[PDB]
Amino acid sequence: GSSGSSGEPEKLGQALTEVYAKANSFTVSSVAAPSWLHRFIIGKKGQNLAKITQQMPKVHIEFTEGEDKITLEGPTEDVSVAQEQIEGMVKDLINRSGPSSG
Secondary structure (H helix, E strand, O other): OOOOOOOOOOOOOOOOOOOOOOOOOOEEEEEEOOOOOHHHHHOOOOOHHHHHHHHOOOOEEEEOOOOOEEEEEEOHHHHHHHHHHHHHHHHHHHHHOOOOOO
16 A cells, blocks of 8 residues: 555574685585576676686586576585676676665
8 A cells, every 4th residue: 555664584694604625526506596587697699608607617507497596516616606606697687677666
């Protein structure tokens, strides 16, 4: 109707600490990403992917239609930087679509 309000959003972060590890092993992590923007996440002329991969070849960016997620393969070192770079662009894309006034 009017004068509405809401909140109680979702949050996470318990017993979290800046830890590290040392071991030459293959690390494969996934990143929760939509598929409706598979054309935007990739780019008109494949630039977003090409760029990332260009800087991080060791990392393998995979895209799924059903799983609706991105599978990364490589060294926890790079995999972390790559998977992160995607978590940022994926957020900006969504934020743009459907501008929240209040």
